[PDB]
Amino acid sequence: MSSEHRCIDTNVPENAACYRYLDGTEEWRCLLYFKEDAGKCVPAPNMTCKDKNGGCAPEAECKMNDKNEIVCKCTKEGSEPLFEGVFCSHH
Hints:
Elements (H helix, E strand, L loop, with lengths): L15 E5 L5 E5 L3 E4 L2 E4 L17 E4 L5 E4 L5 E4 L4 E4 L1
Antiparallel strand pairs: 1-2, 3-4, 5-6, 7-8
């Protein structure tokens, strides 16, 4: 990820990613196969797309793979997945 969007204000939970937006706000999200609860990212090995979009960014498409794997897709053109699609960004 680009250095400008690394978080610098938030003490990020374990097993979470964090993105700092242009407006100065920061958002942390648990990594895939983890689920958020009060500041902790709990292991969630069989979470599905029905539970908060599988942990994929809200604007992403979540698909279940044949192996029961979560596949996030960033659909906007020139959008690319960060952290396997927990966030989607331009380039």
